[PDB]
Design an enzyme around this catalytic site. Structure first.
Site, PDB file in Angstrom:
ATOM      1  N   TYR A  66       0.807  -1.224   0.000  1.00 37.41           N
ATOM      2  CA  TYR A  66       0.000   0.000   0.000  1.00 37.41           C
ATOM      3  C   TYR A  66       0.845   1.281   0.000  1.00 37.41           C
ATOM      4  O   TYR A  66       0.599   2.202   0.774  1.00 37.41           O
ATOM      5  CB  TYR A  66      -1.018  -0.030   1.166  1.00 37.41           C
TER       6      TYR A  66
ATOM      7  N   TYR B 242     -12.253  -7.332   6.027  1.00 32.98           N
ATOM      8  CA  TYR B 242     -11.151  -7.458   5.084  1.00 32.98           C
ATOM      9  C   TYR B 242     -11.036  -8.918   4.675  1.00 32.98           C
ATOM     10  O   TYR B 242     -11.123  -9.801   5.535  1.00 32.98           O
ATOM     11  CB  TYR B 242      -9.813  -6.988   5.691  1.00 32.98           C
TER      12      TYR B 242
ATOM     13  N   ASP C 225     -13.617 -16.528   7.476  1.00 33.04           N
ATOM     14  CA  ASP C 225     -12.283 -16.141   7.088  1.00 33.04           C
ATOM     15  C   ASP C 225     -11.454 -16.020   8.361  1.00 33.04           C
ATOM     16  O   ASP C 225     -11.511 -15.004   9.067  1.00 33.04           O
ATOM     17  CB  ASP C 225     -12.325 -14.828   6.282  1.00 33.04           C
TER      18      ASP C 225
ATOM     19  N   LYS D 184      -1.594 -16.605   7.323  1.00 35.02           N
ATOM     20  CA  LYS D 184      -0.833 -15.794   8.281  1.00 35.02           C
ATOM     21  C   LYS D 184      -0.011 -16.576   9.311  1.00 35.02           C
ATOM     22  O   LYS D 184       1.197 -16.730   9.150  1.00 35.02           O
ATOM     23  CB  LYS D 184      -1.730 -14.760   8.957  1.00 35.02           C
TER      24      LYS D 184
HETATM   25  C1  LIG Z   1      -5.903  -2.657   3.844  1.00 36.02           C
HETATM   26  O1  LIG Z   1      -4.965  -3.508   4.532  1.00 36.02           O
HETATM   27  C2  LIG Z   1      -3.697  -2.990   4.606  1.00 36.02           C
HETATM   28  O2  LIG Z   1      -3.494  -1.784   4.438  1.00 36.02           O
HETATM   29  C3  LIG Z   1      -2.683  -3.909   4.731  1.00 36.02           C
HETATM   30  C4  LIG Z   1      -1.367  -3.700   5.000  1.00 36.02           C
HETATM   31  C5  LIG Z   1      -0.810  -2.504   5.293  1.00 36.02           C
HETATM   32  O3  LIG Z   1      -1.344  -1.784   6.136  1.00 36.02           O
HETATM   33  O4  LIG Z   1       0.388  -2.212   4.706  1.00 36.02           O
HETATM   34  C6  LIG Z   1       1.145  -1.190   5.390  1.00 36.02           C
HETATM   35  C7  LIG Z   1      -0.758  -4.906   4.989  1.00 36.02           C
HETATM   36  C8  LIG Z   1       0.524  -5.301   5.180  1.00 36.02           C
HETATM   37  C9  LIG Z   1       1.067  -6.275   4.318  1.00 36.02           C
HETATM   38  C10 LIG Z   1       2.361  -6.779   4.449  1.00 36.02           C
HETATM   39  C11 LIG Z   1       3.159  -6.289   5.476  1.00 36.02           C
HETATM   40  C12 LIG Z   1       2.641  -5.318   6.340  1.00 36.02           C
HETATM   41  F1  LIG Z   1       3.414  -4.817   7.359  1.00 36.02           F
HETATM   42  C13 LIG Z   1       1.338  -4.834   6.202  1.00 36.02           C
HETATM   43  N1  LIG Z   1      -1.659  -5.831   4.694  1.00 36.02           N
HETATM   44  C14 LIG Z   1      -2.870  -5.224   4.534  1.00 36.02           C
HETATM   45  C15 LIG Z   1      -3.864  -6.086   4.231  1.00 36.02           C
HETATM   46  S1  LIG Z   1      -3.446  -7.689   5.207  1.00 36.02           S
HETATM   47  O5  LIG Z   1      -3.801  -8.772   4.246  1.00 36.02           O
HETATM   48  C16 LIG Z   1      -1.699  -7.334   4.516  1.00 36.02           C
HETATM   49  C1  LIG Z   2      -4.401 -11.076   5.911  1.00 34.90           C
HETATM   50  C2  LIG Z   2      -5.790 -11.500   5.570  1.00 34.90           C
HETATM   51  C3  LIG Z   2      -6.183 -11.951   4.215  1.00 34.90           C
HETATM   52  C4  LIG Z   2      -5.215 -11.960   3.044  1.00 34.90           C
HETATM   53  O1  LIG Z   2      -3.999 -12.653   3.297  1.00 34.90           O
HETATM   54  P1  LIG Z   2      -2.705 -12.336   2.390  1.00 34.90           P
HETATM   55  O2  LIG Z   2      -1.711 -13.427   2.715  1.00 34.90           O
HETATM   56  O3  LIG Z   2      -2.297 -10.950   2.877  1.00 34.90           O
HETATM   57  O4  LIG Z   2      -3.206 -12.361   0.963  1.00 34.90           O
HETATM   58  C5  LIG Z   2      -7.502 -12.338   4.028  1.00 34.90           C
HETATM   59  N1  LIG Z   2      -8.414 -12.338   5.021  1.00 34.90           N
HETATM   60  C6  LIG Z   2      -8.167 -11.944   6.300  1.00 34.90           C
HETATM   61  C7  LIG Z   2      -9.231 -11.947   7.380  1.00 34.90           C
HETATM   62  C8  LIG Z   2      -6.812 -11.490   6.641  1.00 34.90           C
HETATM   63  O5  LIG Z   2      -6.492 -11.107   7.905  1.00 34.90           O
END
Ligand SMILES: COC(=O)c1c(C(=O)OC)c(-c2cccc(F)c2)n2c1C[S@@](=O)C2
Ligand SMILES: *Cc1c(COP(=O)(O)O)cnc(C)c1O
Ligand SMILES: COC(=O)c1c(C(=O)OC)c(-c2cccc(F)c2)n2c1C[S@@](=O)C2
Ligand SMILES: *Cc1c(COP(=O)(O)O)cnc(C)c1O
Ligand SMILES: [Cl-]
Lengths: 425, 429
Positions: B19, B151, B248, B277
């Site tokens: 992001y 999410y 989920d 995760k």
């Molecule tokens: C809308 O959700 C996020 O902004 C987000 C996110 C993030 O905050 O990146 C800084 C991260 C993120 C992803 C990888 C490393 C990290 F430190 C944060 N992720 C998400 C989605 S959860 O599946 C992975």
């Molecule tokens: C983190 C997350 C996902 C997506 O997993 P990624 O490995 O980031 O693609 C989907 N659903 C929920 C509820 C999560 O916390």
């Protein structure tokens, strides 16, 4: 667990790729170099990994330089979140990829799989045009015969018959398809591509194609000059060009990347499969500085994507070593010798009654038959000759590890010829 | 070989982050050089400093980094078999993991489909649901329903069931599938909310494949908790209207919320379940989708004869091996006590934040602690302030929050919460 215990658990609890539950898989117990140890009739056997474990094991299994790189990184840092932090394996691999990929690909987005990397590529394209004030530019165009992954956006550009777009009727995005790209160069194909594209230029974010070799869609080759045409069309009509090199990357087609056969730089590129030399899942999506800057200056201020395990240290470390191992050797002569081995070894297949074509491109060898190949006959037949071969539709094909000796290649091709012989009788 | 400065320079030029932008990052990322137990070693002013991984590296490092038993599991598998294609072959790590996962998830989840990430497992879950109803001769049942605040991933189908604000659907006008959204599920239990959810579902029932929710805790959508009884109502609603139920548990799984899986709080089984995760203890990307025998058989007896999905790295032996060790290590100790102790530590240490002027809420659920503020938390102020106190914390929006490794001692939690309290104070001014 014993092999029989593995089988029983597997039948009750494990989904396999593109399979059912309740409809039998062979137990694998070891892999070293170009060889797998499989359990057959309760007895272990050594067989050549002719498939490279689905395109993945370019340096074979258990390569000491790749083993070392994995345990070395493991001593130090298994993983950290890529949000707010960076690390050496990410930086080293990013620098590598930028340097060896077609020119202009300056930025690197890591993800966990090819399908995801393609969704990322499509996202880059859509955000790019939104950054340019042109949100109408949101469809994708490809030619038929393609494969781009299993996730729902990815599926939308897979061949409509190949990925059977029904039963996905009112579910998939409706994309633009040009006809199958032929093997031989035909100016008339490209002219028709342009004329169809011209009809949709104002709604097209990108053309996405596999360059030179189409993999899971049917192991077809096309003339690299079509890629030159695709680049010119995309330039003139202001459509981004995306090359899916998830199968073609890292020397597999005789060039480092298949785009190189044409001298073409796409706007966006996907890699995976051979990225880690088949140790661990990893993929990457690269784009130009211009694409990156246009996304970053847009309404979102960012590419709205970020997988949890993004840029995983362990995966990046082994990939660095896999890439360096490839670059630090004379890989071109290696691949050339492999292609000549495949070519010479598959020659006699052309005379077999059930064979319609024999084709080789780099370390890819394909016997195209005149009927679907029965796996219940083909798999045990290749096992009998000490080779792991898994046919697909009417294709008896191989993509051996690069470390295969001339003798091993000839053993692989023999088994392929004998499998093809059996289909005809 | 690259120094920290070389890493920063390569990174600013060439690396995307989650992001993020290229060339417009307010703050440069911090170079991580090591991770052991609950601590990361990070470069600040050119110097290596050890700081607590309050975030578990984004929920992943439940047992902490570099855990001897997980390291060993990985090195052992490496000497034997790195990977083989899962097409036509099977192997011991896949079997072992599937058997564990079937045994420890809510009753009735009998089949396991491995993939490489949480988002992919969600797309697989959707594909399972859609193919299921096609196998029943009901191809109209193709839409998804959820409640807001959720999410589910960032691939395009997954995006379609993410909260419309949190997922910025405004930037995706007529790109995404249009799904059915119920209002934000409230914290406290109100049967009026469930009754309204049912009425909304009833009118869409004939076009809905599945309800998809995060059970008990909504993570990346705003760290919100809701009464487990709502999941009991969803199971009942889905049963009666013949709409599949998908939980989920990618964030909630493996003990995080005080139960083995968050569904266990409500004593209910989904038809389809996603995990990820923490699956591999944060070593490697791996996810799974489980479904009942009925879902599996209906898919398999359907016109397509098979689930049309198959990631190239499906059931990777290395990822599966470390996961088996990670799951066994959790099951082999009194994890329930550990999480209760952690939750208590989080509660006691965060309590003085309730009095802070800028704080609207303080809430704990198992090994999860959240301070919700009344305004966005400035990262450029908060990140230095936590580092200064030996804690890696990354706030999100108006939230200051932690999901610490389960191996954190009481003193470590004290240190985590103190840093959180302080970040919150600075939000005041
Ligand atoms: C809308 O959700 C996020 O902004 C987000 C996110 C993030 O905050 O990146 C800084 C991260 C993120 C992803 C990888 C490393 C990290 F430190 C944060 N992720 C998400 C989605 S959860 O599946 C992975
Ligand atoms: C983190 C997350 C996902 C997506 O997993 P990624 O490995 O980031 O693609 C989907 N659903 C929920 C509820 C999560 O916390
Ligand atoms: C339509 O494509 C496939 O059927 C397919 C496939 C497969 O043939 O598994 C039996 C596999 C496959 C996937 C994992 C292992 C394996 F041996 C084969 N894959 C694909 C897509 S490529 O991205 C992954
Ligand atoms: C294998 C492949 C993919 C999908 O990669 P996964 O890692 O299996 O998701 C996508 N595109 C092409 C061209 C491929 O060969
Ligand atoms: Cl310490």
């Amino acid at each position: 667990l014993t092999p029989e215990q593995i089988i029983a658990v597997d039948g009750a609890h494990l989904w396999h790729p593109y399979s059912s539950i309740g409809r039998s898989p062979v137990v694998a117990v070891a892999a070293h170099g170009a060889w797998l140890t499989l359990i057959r009739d309760g007895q272990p056997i050594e067989v050549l990994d002719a498939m490279s474990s689905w395109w993945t094991a370019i340096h074979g299994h258990g390569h000491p330089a790749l083993d070392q790189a994995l345990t070395t990184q493991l001593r130090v840092m298994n993983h950290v979140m890529f949000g707010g932090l960076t690390h050496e394996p990410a930086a080293r691999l990013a620098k590598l990829l930028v340097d060896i990929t077609p020119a202009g690909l300056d930025t690197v987005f890591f993800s966990d799989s090819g399908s995801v990397s393609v969704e990322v590529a499509a996202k880059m394209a859509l955000q790019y045009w939104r950054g340019r004030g042109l949100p109408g530019k949101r469809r994708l165009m490809t030619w038929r015969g393609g494969y781009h992954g299993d996730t729902f956006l990815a599926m939308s550009i897979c061949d409509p018959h190949g990925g059977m777009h029904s039963l996905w009727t009112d579910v998939l995005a409706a994309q633009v398809f040009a006809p199958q790209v032929p093997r031989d160069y035909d100016p008339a194909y490209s002219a028709a591509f342009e004329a169809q594209l011209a009809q949709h230029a104002g709604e097209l974010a990108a053309v996405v194609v596999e360059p030179v070799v189409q993999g899971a869609g049917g192991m077809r080759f096309h003339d690299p000059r079509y890629l030159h045409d695709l680049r010119d069309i995309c330039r003139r009509y202001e459509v981004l060009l995306i090359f899916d090199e998830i199968a073609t990357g890292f020397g597999r087609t005789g060039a480092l990347f298949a785009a190189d056969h044409a001298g073409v730089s796409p706007d966006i590129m996907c890699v995976g499969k051979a990225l880690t030399g088949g140790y661990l899942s990893l993929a990457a999506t690269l784009c130009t500085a211009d694409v990156a800057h246009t996304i970053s200056a847009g309404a979102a201020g960012a590419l709205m994507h970020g997988p949890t395990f993004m840029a995983n240290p362990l995966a990046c470390a082994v990939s660095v070593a896999s890439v360096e191992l490839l670059l630090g050797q004379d890989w071109r002569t290696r691949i050339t010798e492999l292609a000549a081995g495949l070519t010479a070894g598959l020659d006699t297949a052309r005379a077999l009654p059930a064979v319609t074509d024999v084709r080789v491109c780099g370390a890819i060898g394909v016997i195209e038959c005149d009927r679907p190949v029965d796996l219940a006959v083909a798999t045990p037949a290749a096992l009998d000759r000490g080779v792991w071969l898994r046919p697909f539709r009417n294709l008896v094909y191989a993509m051996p590890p690069y470390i295969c000796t001339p003798a091993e290649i000839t053993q692989i091709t023999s088994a392929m010829v004998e499998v093809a012989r059996l289909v005809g009788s």
